[PDB]
Amino acid sequence: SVSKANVPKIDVSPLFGDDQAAKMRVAQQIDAASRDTGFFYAVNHGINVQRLSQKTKEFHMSITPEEKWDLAIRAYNKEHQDQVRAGYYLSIPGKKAVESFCYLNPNFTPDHPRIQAKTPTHEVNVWPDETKHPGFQDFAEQYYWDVFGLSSALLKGYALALGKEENFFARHFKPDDTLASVVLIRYPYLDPYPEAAIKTAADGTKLSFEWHEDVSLITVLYQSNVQNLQVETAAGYQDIEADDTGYLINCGSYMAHLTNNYYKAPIHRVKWVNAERQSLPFFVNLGYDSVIDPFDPREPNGKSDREPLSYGDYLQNGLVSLINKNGQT
């Protein structure tokens, strides 16, 4: 008795080119979806998602328990105090089913100025041994740049949709300092599936992850073809159809702040499904010092009564708050 959510498929290919009128017609579709359910599928995006899924599968099914401890974030391994964001997030058999691997900007090297200053939210990525996972690091770093390029084009569409010049968001989204992350999430098939790893919503729906708003400017997600996401609308939680050929896009709470809730961060949750599947989000984050002055496209003078918030302040506070609300992933 759950209605299907309206999640339009938008051909975003004009956002990579120079046909300005064509780009405005894409921007209108982004505006409409952002004002409706808050979700859309970006199609004709140019990324080889089948290869992404194959390379990610090869990694998840070959990594060993030894490697997981050696790559583990601080929540699982006290020896790794510098790893708050980047590294392996272990499962706990009988208690926690999901496991994942997160990496950040490949330009965050030991010599990067923010790494030298030990600025919060910046970390040097950790990678498994090359002989054990041949080609993985190179593939994953190239994927970061492929999805960064898609995300820059999507940000041009959001800017045009809000009545701004196309580089309004994209000028703060740069290869040398973006705080964007990739997460390679594995949701396992388990027989028997631990009840401790299943949450229950107030409406009785079985979930893997509770309701939340994303901590991002926008979220650019690839998932296997297994339906699982739900979005809260006025008519209740609705099912978001799977589409393993497109990227599912939504706004995060930084976009809601900047637009004075004109483009809301949709509240959504992840249903429990007993299936072996992948979920590969790219969280589009700006730079640490990036500050966009808030505005309101519903008001004639475009002024907002919100205070400017630096992206760095937003992000570190948001990641902690999400772990406190919905648990350590």
- Residues found near ligand SCV in the complex (CB under 6 A): 85, 102, 181, 183, 185, 209, 214, 219, 221, 270, 279, 281, 283, 319, 322, 329
| Per-residue CA distances from 326 to 202, 239, 289 (Å) | 14, 20, 27
255 secondary structure, DSSP code: H
| Alpha-helical segments (H) within 4-129 | 20-35, 49-62, 65-71, 113-116
Active site residue 209: yes
Give residue number: closest CB to ligand SCV.
279
Active site residue 214: yes
In the complex with Fe ion, the residue whose CB is nearer, 31 or 214, is 214
Query: Distance between CA 150 and CA 136 in Å, rounded?
Result: 21
Q: Residue type for 143, please?
A: Y
268 is in an annotated binding site: yes
Structure tokens at 319: 């990641």
Give min distance, CB of 89 to ligand SCV, in A: 7
In the complex with ligand SCV, the residue whose CB is nearer, 25 or 325, is 325
Q: Which of 268, 208, 225 is nearest to 5 (CA)?
A: 268
Residue 319 touches which member of ligand SCV, Fe ion, none, C-beta under 5-8 Å by kind: ligand SCV
Location of structure tokens 């009785």 = 204
Location of structure tokens 């809601």 = 256
Structure tokens at 243: 């589409």
Active site residue 268: yes
Q: Give 87: exposed, middle or buried? Use CB within 10 Å, 0-12, 13-18, 19+.
A: buried
Give min distance, CB of 180 to ligand SCV, in A: 8
Q: Residue type for 168, please?
A: F
Task: Tell me which residues touch Fe ion (CB under 5 A).
Answer: 214
Catalytic hit among 133, 268, 282, 283 = 268
Active site residue 60: no
Residue 296 touches which member of ligand SCV, Fe ion, none, C-beta under 5-8 Å by kind: none
**Residues annotated within a binding site for Fe(2+):** 212, 214, 268
Which residues are part of the catalytic machinery? 209, 212, 214, 268
**Residues annotated within a binding site for isopenicillin N:** 85, 89, 181, 187, 279
**Residues annotated within a binding site:** 85, 89, 181, 187, 212, 214, 268, 277, 279
